[PDB]
Amino acid sequence: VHVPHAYPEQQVDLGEITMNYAEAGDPDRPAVLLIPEQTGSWWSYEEAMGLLSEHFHVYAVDLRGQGRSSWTPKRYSLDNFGNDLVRFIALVVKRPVVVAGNSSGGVLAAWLSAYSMPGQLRGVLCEDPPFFASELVPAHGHSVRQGAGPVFELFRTYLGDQWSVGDWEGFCRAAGASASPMARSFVADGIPQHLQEYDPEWARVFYEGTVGLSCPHERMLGQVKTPVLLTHHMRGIDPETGNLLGALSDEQALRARRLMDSAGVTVDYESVPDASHMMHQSAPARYVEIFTRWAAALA
Amino acid sequence: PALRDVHVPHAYPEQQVDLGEITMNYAEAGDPDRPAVLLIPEQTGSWWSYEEAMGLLSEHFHVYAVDLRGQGRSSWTPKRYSLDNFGNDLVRFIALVVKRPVVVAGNSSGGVLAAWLSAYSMPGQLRGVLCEDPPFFASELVPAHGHSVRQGAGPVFELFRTYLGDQWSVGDWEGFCRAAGASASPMARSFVADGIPQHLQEYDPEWARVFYEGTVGLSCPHERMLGQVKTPVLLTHHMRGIDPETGNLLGALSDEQALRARRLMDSAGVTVDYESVPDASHMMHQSAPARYVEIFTRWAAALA
Amino acid sequence: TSPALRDVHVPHAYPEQQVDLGEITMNYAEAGDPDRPAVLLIPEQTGSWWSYEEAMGLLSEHFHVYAVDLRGQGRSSWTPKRYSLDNFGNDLVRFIALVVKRPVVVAGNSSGGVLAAWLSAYSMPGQLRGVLCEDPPFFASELVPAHGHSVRQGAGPVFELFRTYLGDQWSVGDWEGFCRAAGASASPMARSFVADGIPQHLQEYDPEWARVFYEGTVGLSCPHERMLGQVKTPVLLTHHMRGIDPETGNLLGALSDEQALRARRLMDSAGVTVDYESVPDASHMMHQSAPARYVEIFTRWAAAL
Amino acid sequence: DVHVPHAYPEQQVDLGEITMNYAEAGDPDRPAVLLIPEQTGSWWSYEEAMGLLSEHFHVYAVDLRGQGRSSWTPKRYSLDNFGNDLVRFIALVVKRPVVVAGNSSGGVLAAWLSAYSMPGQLRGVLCEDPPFFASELVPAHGHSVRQGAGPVFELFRTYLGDQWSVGDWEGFCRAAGASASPMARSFVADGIPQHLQEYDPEWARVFYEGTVGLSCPHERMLGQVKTPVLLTHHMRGIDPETGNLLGALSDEQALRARRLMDSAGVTVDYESVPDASHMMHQSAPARYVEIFTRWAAAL
């Protein structure tokens, strides 16, 4: 299923799983780790990796259940993703890292900041993170069922765990009829390449609230141990449904920022209301600029 | 309280009816020829929660006020507390005792059960329902609109579950008061008292468990309940607000949740009458009985 | 003509009618002289009222027989998000109060046999003379039973296949995918359902049924321990084929010998008369595979009542 | 607040989210061994055995999170989190291949490490009377936890409570003496045992509610082991009055565990000691140490 890409691909044995990834930049430059969004593979960062390879040693990784990394039925949880990335940092990077993650990847960047092995990290970028919005029963704001829940429901029903169903036509019919604008956005004639590399059990665990069941966001956010850059992209409310448009509300962002303040770290909050969910794709230069500014200030 | 030897006297005499699984305790007032009314109390509330309002309404109505299962002298039923079990209990009560079409008034939890009846009773049993400060969507763990119970009254339910326990099996009122006095929830700070209130002595705290854990209405989502109401609905909306410190709701339901609930009930095609009294306490039938009875009597007069 | 469209019902030997119970419409068939003792037949899961067709005939010569489609089945209402033991049971309570209007002898198969017991414990007073539980999955249909194997070691495999490949209200409807998955399954029951076309009874079936059993929500507020321990009418429990799949250890049949033992002990503690008829040579749906045997068993029992 | 003197000095190490307390015996000349206690069991559960083992092994006995002097972590008690804790401990303290040995819940974590640790971390594992499948809420084979140890877990959750928030030992004893579960009755005592004073009862909650193993089904674990295994099966039977399990796991559950582990391609040794207590390393130290040493020398 796997198509050619700009950078050569490598695979590492993290124990339970094998992780696919891709390197860029001069080795001696500072290390950067790029975590894709859900339904996103490492080559989600390609453009940005280019821009970033000028100054950093860039690693971009396929999480488990994505890309060419291992698919693990019944094993998708926040802690398993996070310890995957911890083992990657220790076995492959072998140096302190600045982590950047988009959406679910941003959630795992915060997870690393709070729960990585000591001194594994210098700072994390959380790019449009669904703090509390990706939870089934958050401590603040809307649940996943009022956010991206609908999209996940469609993935679970019509694609199935490990593409066991694979009813793409049914998926497009129901998605086009969804009141969720994001749901109606995922419609296409053929299956996008990124979804072909995606295990839809990801959707199941987010929709059903099991992925973070033992990793509540308030404790994560209250236990961060590194500087955090939080970018906050398009956001809004669908008047017809009340549902959250975007990754997280202003209220949820404020609560997350104040929890991270209680953890005693320094937070750079950059509201970019006009940016798309995946700014590293829609506007690679703007994203690399923000990241580089914040990164220079560390250590 | 766990021995259930706490019954005390009241203004009206008390009757009991076998409904099948449970026995329901209840009180009755007014001329039996008058239009029938069914009063459903709030959680932790017994029938006598309506005593005062029964004394006014009785002058114009045949009033029945009930103890739901797990409250008062009605049966306590471990592992059996769901919205459908409460509702079908009330259906059987209407069929076996009232034997007339009723107008139903419910407060908080009862108001939700009132809407339940409006949607799910046997045909013809109801002429209309009053939902008094109902936690529409705010009592669900995963509501379709707005904020979950965990961001509302879930803190107090958690205290009840941990420190009082199913059927008062723990009964650590000292630990409960200690934790309640230190809660960010003001509603929890309300319950702190030197002695256990009579209404809490008659209350089975497994109630609190099933609401806090999301099991009580798991098979009865509020979106569909409200989208299938079948009688005129009178929804009163009392004090609501936001604790600036927590972002957790104060009061029964948020403005957004009231809005979406009204939209659902209108899609059901019923006449919805929204009466907003932001200065009113949660149990207006107890704190301002005259005002409550006036509102109810005016709306009920227009029913038929 | 699609199971999702609910336009697949076919003619049958007995007249059908629908009653408004308030949330749902319940479809039902009637047979026999309306003055003879009343009887209520509850089908099995994926079973419609005409699951009893043949038995109805034999029984209608001595009983006024009602046979019902439960919600989520046949021509009764399909109610998304509303499928639970208590809702099924209260539908049947309503049906007895509104249609039969006389005390009834209830007989239910499998899931229906679990609802017969439900009624015996939780119905309105005086509604029932006795109940016949035909191969009921006591404890084996629960996700976390007090005794014996869970539904995941019983019928769960086939329920998972229904949920995944048919979907709520036939929203997925991938019959060929279901057949491929079922034929490769290690559950013999699951393999049984493979067929060239979709069987008629399954066309009338809301597979959300399967979901609520597979996920353990259908009986969450109705633990079988409490139900069985609060029966208030005489109960006849028939126990058909049962065994253990050696490759898996999973239950073959409706319930295990141990689970039937514990259920009988519970019911005996309730103070009711309990009859136990172990018929190890009988299929799960004895009322279909051996109608005359079934009617003999039922007739003796009901005449004692 | 309650820790008392023991036969060995205690050490602590920061694993990144938690602080793990532990004790050490024997010499670095000798091969590394990692002892994992049972639930409610602290490191000193192994004290006597440690002595014997220190004759020929460098021994590490650990406090798991929520036990002893290790960090208490509310809402974070999952098998994956315990397991990644022990992976971190092996990586940061032992820094050597280790022969792991765990008892009861500890045996389950030993299996977890065999299947899911970082590559090359382990040489083999001894699962001592492990509750394979019988500690799960919905096991793929045999009794569930609710027909096993679940009754005592429910008593712990209702009367001791999260982080000893309730602490009603009188009520615990009243309920335990009236328990139909004989193990529940075995926990009745005048005062609170020292091992239970260092124990966080949220442990009991997450086993009773089935959250701890939700994302770690035992069938996948056992089918993906990667080291030689030694499984010891102690006392087991059935309570006639309830049908409930006596012991860690049934004969059927042991049979299925072994079939899975053998399907994984490892060397599985099965040692049935039907007359042994649950904590044989405590009740018969020399017997336990003989069995362990006899097996570990083959590695």
PDB file of N, CA, C and O in Angstrom, chain B residues 80 82-88 92 116 120 216-221, chain C residues 21 23-24 26 70-71 79-95 115 118-119 122 208-209 212 217-219 221-222:
ATOM      1  N   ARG B  80     -30.859  -1.925  40.797  1.00  0.00           N
ATOM      2  CA  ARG B  80     -32.016  -1.788  39.915  1.00  0.00           C
ATOM      3  C   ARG B  80     -32.408  -0.337  39.635  1.00  0.00           C
ATOM      4  O   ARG B  80     -33.515  -0.086  39.149  1.00  0.00           O
ATOM      5  N   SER B  82     -32.533   2.701  37.495  1.00  0.00           N
ATOM      6  CA  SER B  82     -32.399   3.246  36.151  1.00  0.00           C
ATOM      7  C   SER B  82     -33.566   4.192  35.904  1.00  0.00           C
ATOM      8  O   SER B  82     -34.600   4.109  36.569  1.00  0.00           O
ATOM      9  N   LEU B  83     -33.402   5.092  34.930  1.00  0.00           N
ATOM     10  CA  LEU B  83     -34.504   5.985  34.575  1.00  0.00           C
ATOM     11  C   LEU B  83     -35.735   5.195  34.141  1.00  0.00           C
ATOM     12  O   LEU B  83     -36.871   5.593  34.421  1.00  0.00           O
ATOM     13  N   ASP B  84     -35.530   4.070  33.446  1.00  0.00           N
ATOM     14  CA  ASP B  84     -36.664   3.283  32.968  1.00  0.00           C
ATOM     15  C   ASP B  84     -37.388   2.596  34.116  1.00  0.00           C
ATOM     16  O   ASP B  84     -38.615   2.453  34.078  1.00  0.00           O
ATOM     17  N   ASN B  85     -36.656   2.173  35.145  1.00  0.00           N
ATOM     18  CA  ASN B  85     -37.310   1.537  36.284  1.00  0.00           C
ATOM     19  C   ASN B  85     -38.111   2.556  37.093  1.00  0.00           C
ATOM     20  O   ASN B  85     -39.269   2.294  37.448  1.00  0.00           O
ATOM     21  N   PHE B  86     -37.544   3.745  37.341  1.00  0.00           N
ATOM     22  CA  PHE B  86     -38.322   4.811  37.977  1.00  0.00           C
ATOM     23  C   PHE B  86     -39.578   5.120  37.163  1.00  0.00           C
ATOM     24  O   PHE B  86     -40.695   5.205  37.703  1.00  0.00           O
ATOM     25  N   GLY B  87     -39.405   5.303  35.850  1.00  0.00           N
ATOM     26  CA  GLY B  87     -40.524   5.701  35.016  1.00  0.00           C
ATOM     27  C   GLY B  87     -41.626   4.663  34.982  1.00  0.00           C
ATOM     28  O   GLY B  87     -42.809   4.995  35.095  1.00  0.00           O
ATOM     29  N   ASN B  88     -41.260   3.390  34.819  1.00  0.00           N
ATOM     30  CA  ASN B  88     -42.285   2.358  34.735  1.00  0.00           C
ATOM     31  C   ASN B  88     -42.944   2.134  36.088  1.00  0.00           C
ATOM     32  O   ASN B  88     -44.137   1.806  36.141  1.00  0.00           O
ATOM     33  N   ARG B  92     -47.018   2.333  36.492  1.00  0.00           N
ATOM     34  CA  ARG B  92     -47.837   1.382  37.233  1.00  0.00           C
ATOM     35  C   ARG B  92     -48.612   2.073  38.346  1.00  0.00           C
ATOM     36  O   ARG B  92     -49.758   1.712  38.626  1.00  0.00           O
ATOM     37  N   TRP B 116     -39.754  11.931  31.026  1.00  0.00           N
ATOM     38  CA  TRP B 116     -39.816  10.509  30.721  1.00  0.00           C
ATOM     39  C   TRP B 116     -41.261  10.071  30.541  1.00  0.00           C
ATOM     40  O   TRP B 116     -41.624   9.480  29.514  1.00  0.00           O
ATOM     41  N   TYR B 120     -42.936   8.333  27.378  1.00  0.00           N
ATOM     42  CA  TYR B 120     -42.837   6.880  27.420  1.00  0.00           C
ATOM     43  C   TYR B 120     -43.930   6.211  28.244  1.00  0.00           C
ATOM     44  O   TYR B 120     -43.875   4.991  28.443  1.00  0.00           O
ATOM     45  N   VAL B 216     -27.465   5.219  35.239  1.00  0.00           N
ATOM     46  CA  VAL B 216     -28.890   5.362  35.511  1.00  0.00           C
ATOM     47  C   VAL B 216     -29.670   5.567  34.217  1.00  0.00           C
ATOM     48  O   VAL B 216     -30.760   5.012  34.039  1.00  0.00           O
ATOM     49  N   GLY B 217     -29.131   6.362  33.299  1.00  0.00           N
ATOM     50  CA  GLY B 217     -29.831   6.660  32.067  1.00  0.00           C
ATOM     51  C   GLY B 217     -29.106   6.162  30.834  1.00  0.00           C
ATOM     52  O   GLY B 217     -29.402   6.599  29.719  1.00  0.00           O
ATOM     53  N   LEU B 218     -28.160   5.238  31.022  1.00  0.00           N
ATOM     54  CA  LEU B 218     -27.380   4.732  29.895  1.00  0.00           C
ATOM     55  C   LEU B 218     -28.273   4.254  28.755  1.00  0.00           C
ATOM     56  O   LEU B 218     -27.988   4.513  27.581  1.00  0.00           O
ATOM     57  N   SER B 219     -29.348   3.541  29.077  1.00  0.00           N
ATOM     58  CA  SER B 219     -30.285   3.061  28.074  1.00  0.00           C
ATOM     59  C   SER B 219     -31.440   4.025  27.847  1.00  0.00           C
ATOM     60  O   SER B 219     -32.438   3.645  27.223  1.00  0.00           O
ATOM     61  N   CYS B 220     -31.339   5.251  28.355  1.00  0.00           N
ATOM     62  CA  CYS B 220     -32.369   6.274  28.181  1.00  0.00           C
ATOM     63  C   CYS B 220     -31.697   7.617  27.944  1.00  0.00           C
ATOM     64  O   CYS B 220     -31.718   8.505  28.804  1.00  0.00           O
ATOM     65  N   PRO B 221     -31.080   7.798  26.776  1.00  0.00           N
ATOM     66  CA  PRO B 221     -30.425   9.081  26.480  1.00  0.00           C
ATOM     67  C   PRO B 221     -31.437  10.216  26.426  1.00  0.00           C
ATOM     68  O   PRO B 221     -32.545  10.059  25.910  1.00  0.00           O
TER      69      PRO B 221
ATOM     70  N   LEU C  21     -48.250   0.686  22.665  1.00  0.00           N
ATOM     71  CA  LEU C  21     -47.915   0.561  24.076  1.00  0.00           C
ATOM     72  C   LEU C  21     -47.431   1.875  24.679  1.00  0.00           C
ATOM     73  O   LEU C  21     -47.284   1.965  25.903  1.00  0.00           O
ATOM     74  N   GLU C  23     -44.530   4.022  23.865  1.00  0.00           N
ATOM     75  CA  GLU C  23     -43.288   4.360  23.176  1.00  0.00           C
ATOM     76  C   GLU C  23     -43.213   3.611  21.852  1.00  0.00           C
ATOM     77  O   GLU C  23     -42.833   4.191  20.828  1.00  0.00           O
ATOM     78  N   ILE C  24     -43.617   2.341  21.865  1.00  0.00           N
ATOM     79  CA  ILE C  24     -43.491   1.469  20.715  1.00  0.00           C
ATOM     80  C   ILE C  24     -44.868   1.026  20.240  1.00  0.00           C
ATOM     81  O   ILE C  24     -45.869   1.090  20.958  1.00  0.00           O
ATOM     82  N   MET C  26     -46.241  -2.649  19.049  1.00  0.00           N
ATOM     83  CA  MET C  26     -45.875  -4.059  19.161  1.00  0.00           C
ATOM     84  C   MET C  26     -46.797  -4.846  18.240  1.00  0.00           C
ATOM     85  O   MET C  26     -48.026  -4.718  18.325  1.00  0.00           O
ATOM     86  N   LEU C  70     -40.978  -8.635  19.656  1.00  0.00           N
ATOM     87  CA  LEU C  70     -40.393  -7.676  20.578  1.00  0.00           C
ATOM     88  C   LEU C  70     -39.890  -6.449  19.818  1.00  0.00           C
ATOM     89  O   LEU C  70     -39.685  -6.478  18.601  1.00  0.00           O
ATOM     90  N   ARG C  71     -39.686  -5.355  20.552  1.00  0.00           N
ATOM     91  CA  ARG C  71     -39.086  -4.177  19.940  1.00  0.00           C
ATOM     92  C   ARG C  71     -37.728  -4.545  19.351  1.00  0.00           C
ATOM     93  O   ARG C  71     -37.000  -5.380  19.899  1.00  0.00           O
ATOM     94  N   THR C  79     -36.164   0.892  18.113  1.00  0.00           N
ATOM     95  CA  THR C  79     -35.890   2.012  19.012  1.00  0.00           C
ATOM     96  C   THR C  79     -34.393   2.088  19.271  1.00  0.00           C
ATOM     97  O   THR C  79     -33.873   1.438  20.190  1.00  0.00           O
ATOM     98  N   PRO C  80     -33.666   2.875  18.488  1.00  0.00           N
ATOM     99  CA  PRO C  80     -32.225   3.009  18.731  1.00  0.00           C
ATOM    100  C   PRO C  80     -31.942   3.492  20.149  1.00  0.00           C
ATOM    101  O   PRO C  80     -32.682   4.302  20.711  1.00  0.00           O
ATOM    102  N   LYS C  81     -30.873   2.957  20.735  1.00  0.00           N
ATOM    103  CA  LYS C  81     -30.344   3.342  22.038  1.00  0.00           C
ATOM    104  C   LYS C  81     -31.234   2.948  23.209  1.00  0.00           C
ATOM    105  O   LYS C  81     -30.946   3.346  24.345  1.00  0.00           O
ATOM    106  N   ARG C  82     -32.303   2.179  22.977  1.00  0.00           N
ATOM    107  CA  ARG C  82     -33.303   1.921  24.009  1.00  0.00           C
ATOM    108  C   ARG C  82     -33.455   0.449  24.369  1.00  0.00           C
ATOM    109  O   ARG C  82     -34.408   0.091  25.072  1.00  0.00           O
ATOM    110  N   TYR C  83     -32.550  -0.413  23.927  1.00  0.00           N
ATOM    111  CA  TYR C  83     -32.721  -1.852  24.090  1.00  0.00           C
ATOM    112  C   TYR C  83     -32.121  -2.288  25.420  1.00  0.00           C
ATOM    113  O   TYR C  83     -30.899  -2.257  25.599  1.00  0.00           O
ATOM    114  N   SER C  84     -32.984  -2.710  26.343  1.00  0.00           N
ATOM    115  CA  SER C  84     -32.565  -3.237  27.631  1.00  0.00           C
ATOM    116  C   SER C  84     -33.592  -4.258  28.105  1.00  0.00           C
ATOM    117  O   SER C  84     -34.753  -4.240  27.687  1.00  0.00           O
ATOM    118  N   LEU C  85     -33.153  -5.136  29.014  1.00  0.00           N
ATOM    119  CA  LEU C  85     -34.061  -6.129  29.582  1.00  0.00           C
ATOM    120  C   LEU C  85     -35.293  -5.469  30.193  1.00  0.00           C
ATOM    121  O   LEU C  85     -36.422  -5.929  29.983  1.00  0.00           O
ATOM    122  N   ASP C  86     -35.098  -4.385  30.949  1.00  0.00           N
ATOM    123  CA  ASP C  86     -36.223  -3.742  31.619  1.00  0.00           C
ATOM    124  C   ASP C  86     -37.216  -3.164  30.613  1.00  0.00           C
ATOM    125  O   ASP C  86     -38.432  -3.237  30.823  1.00  0.00           O
ATOM    126  N   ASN C  87     -36.726  -2.583  29.514  1.00  0.00           N
ATOM    127  CA  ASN C  87     -37.642  -2.012  28.527  1.00  0.00           C
ATOM    128  C   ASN C  87     -38.427  -3.105  27.800  1.00  0.00           C
ATOM    129  O   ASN C  87     -39.647  -2.991  27.624  1.00  0.00           O
ATOM    130  N   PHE C  88     -37.748  -4.176  27.372  1.00  0.00           N
ATOM    131  CA  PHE C  88     -38.448  -5.330  26.806  1.00  0.00           C
ATOM    132  C   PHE C  88     -39.540  -5.823  27.755  1.00  0.00           C
ATOM    133  O   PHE C  88     -40.702  -6.031  27.367  1.00  0.00           O
ATOM    134  N   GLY C  89     -39.162  -6.037  29.016  1.00  0.00           N
ATOM    135  CA  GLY C  89     -40.099  -6.582  29.977  1.00  0.00           C
ATOM    136  C   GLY C  89     -41.282  -5.670  30.224  1.00  0.00           C
ATOM    137  O   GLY C  89     -42.414  -6.135  30.372  1.00  0.00           O
ATOM    138  N   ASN C  90     -41.045  -4.361  30.284  1.00  0.00           N
ATOM    139  CA  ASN C  90     -42.151  -3.457  30.549  1.00  0.00           C
ATOM    140  C   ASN C  90     -43.048  -3.327  29.332  1.00  0.00           C
ATOM    141  O   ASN C  90     -44.259  -3.115  29.477  1.00  0.00           O
ATOM    142  N   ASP C  91     -42.486  -3.487  28.130  1.00  0.00           N
ATOM    143  CA  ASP C  91     -43.326  -3.628  26.947  1.00  0.00           C
ATOM    144  C   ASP C  91     -44.289  -4.792  27.124  1.00  0.00           C
ATOM    145  O   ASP C  91     -45.487  -4.671  26.852  1.00  0.00           O
ATOM    146  N   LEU C  92     -43.771  -5.945  27.564  1.00  0.00           N
ATOM    147  CA  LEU C  92     -44.637  -7.117  27.704  1.00  0.00           C
ATOM    148  C   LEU C  92     -45.666  -6.932  28.821  1.00  0.00           C
ATOM    149  O   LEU C  92     -46.816  -7.373  28.695  1.00  0.00           O
ATOM    150  N   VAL C  93     -45.270  -6.292  29.923  1.00  0.00           N
ATOM    151  CA  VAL C  93     -46.234  -5.931  30.962  1.00  0.00           C
ATOM    152  C   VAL C  93     -47.362  -5.099  30.361  1.00  0.00           C
ATOM    153  O   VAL C  93     -48.553  -5.348  30.606  1.00  0.00           O
ATOM    154  N   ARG C  94     -46.998  -4.090  29.563  1.00  0.00           N
ATOM    155  CA  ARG C  94     -47.999  -3.235  28.935  1.00  0.00           C
ATOM    156  C   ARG C  94     -48.890  -4.030  27.995  1.00  0.00           C
ATOM    157  O   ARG C  94     -50.097  -3.785  27.912  1.00  0.00           O
ATOM    158  N   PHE C  95     -48.298  -4.960  27.246  1.00  0.00           N
ATOM    159  CA  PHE C  95     -49.067  -5.747  26.292  1.00  0.00           C
ATOM    160  C   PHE C  95     -50.096  -6.602  27.009  1.00  0.00           C
ATOM    161  O   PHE C  95     -51.250  -6.704  26.574  1.00  0.00           O
ATOM    162  N   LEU C 115     -36.757 -13.192  29.493  1.00  0.00           N
ATOM    163  CA  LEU C 115     -37.792 -12.196  29.758  1.00  0.00           C
ATOM    164  C   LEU C 115     -39.006 -12.805  30.453  1.00  0.00           C
ATOM    165  O   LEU C 115     -39.650 -12.135  31.271  1.00  0.00           O
ATOM    166  N   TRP C 118     -38.070 -12.539  33.809  1.00  0.00           N
ATOM    167  CA  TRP C 118     -38.183 -11.138  34.185  1.00  0.00           C
ATOM    168  C   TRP C 118     -39.601 -10.859  34.647  1.00  0.00           C
ATOM    169  O   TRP C 118     -39.829 -10.380  35.766  1.00  0.00           O
ATOM    170  N   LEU C 119     -40.574 -11.258  33.824  1.00  0.00           N
ATOM    171  CA  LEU C 119     -41.964 -10.995  34.156  1.00  0.00           C
ATOM    172  C   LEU C 119     -42.320 -11.668  35.470  1.00  0.00           C
ATOM    173  O   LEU C 119     -42.864 -11.027  36.381  1.00  0.00           O
ATOM    174  N   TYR C 122     -40.926  -9.338  38.006  1.00  0.00           N
ATOM    175  CA  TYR C 122     -41.046  -7.883  37.976  1.00  0.00           C
ATOM    176  C   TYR C 122     -42.303  -7.391  37.262  1.00  0.00           C
ATOM    177  O   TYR C 122     -42.391  -6.206  36.927  1.00  0.00           O
ATOM    178  N   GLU C 208     -28.754  -4.057  16.560  1.00  0.00           N
ATOM    179  CA  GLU C 208     -28.374  -3.403  17.807  1.00  0.00           C
ATOM    180  C   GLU C 208     -28.644  -4.318  18.996  1.00  0.00           C
ATOM    181  O   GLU C 208     -27.919  -4.271  19.996  1.00  0.00           O
ATOM    182  N   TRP C 209     -29.670  -5.167  18.898  1.00  0.00           N
ATOM    183  CA  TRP C 209     -29.823  -6.267  19.840  1.00  0.00           C
ATOM    184  C   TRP C 209     -28.454  -6.861  20.162  1.00  0.00           C
ATOM    185  O   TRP C 209     -28.000  -6.876  21.316  1.00  0.00           O
ATOM    186  N   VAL C 212     -26.058  -4.698  22.174  1.00  0.00           N
ATOM    187  CA  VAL C 212     -26.284  -4.480  23.598  1.00  0.00           C
ATOM    188  C   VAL C 212     -25.957  -5.745  24.376  1.00  0.00           C
ATOM    189  O   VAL C 212     -25.609  -5.680  25.561  1.00  0.00           O
ATOM    190  N   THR C 217     -24.644  -3.964  28.008  1.00  0.00           N
ATOM    191  CA  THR C 217     -25.522  -2.893  28.463  1.00  0.00           C
ATOM    192  C   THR C 217     -26.980  -3.320  28.605  1.00  0.00           C
ATOM    193  O   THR C 217     -27.722  -2.674  29.354  1.00  0.00           O
ATOM    194  N   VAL C 218     -27.400  -4.394  27.928  1.00  0.00           N
ATOM    195  CA  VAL C 218     -28.818  -4.758  27.907  1.00  0.00           C
ATOM    196  C   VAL C 218     -29.314  -5.154  29.292  1.00  0.00           C
ATOM    197  O   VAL C 218     -30.489  -4.948  29.618  1.00  0.00           O
ATOM    198  N   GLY C 219     -28.450  -5.729  30.125  1.00  0.00           N
ATOM    199  CA  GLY C 219     -28.884  -6.186  31.433  1.00  0.00           C
ATOM    200  C   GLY C 219     -28.139  -5.534  32.579  1.00  0.00           C
ATOM    201  O   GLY C 219     -28.165  -6.020  33.713  1.00  0.00           O
ATOM    202  N   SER C 221     -28.632  -2.915  34.450  1.00  0.00           N
ATOM    203  CA  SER C 221     -29.443  -2.614  35.623  1.00  0.00           C
ATOM    204  C   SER C 221     -30.407  -3.745  35.959  1.00  0.00           C
ATOM    205  O   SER C 221     -31.353  -3.547  36.729  1.00  0.00           O
ATOM    206  N   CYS C 222     -30.191  -4.923  35.381  1.00  0.00           N
ATOM    207  CA  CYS C 222     -31.007  -6.104  35.659  1.00  0.00           C
ATOM    208  C   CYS C 222     -30.099  -7.318  35.812  1.00  0.00           C
ATOM    209  O   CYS C 222     -30.079  -8.215  34.960  1.00  0.00           O
TER     210      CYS C 222
END
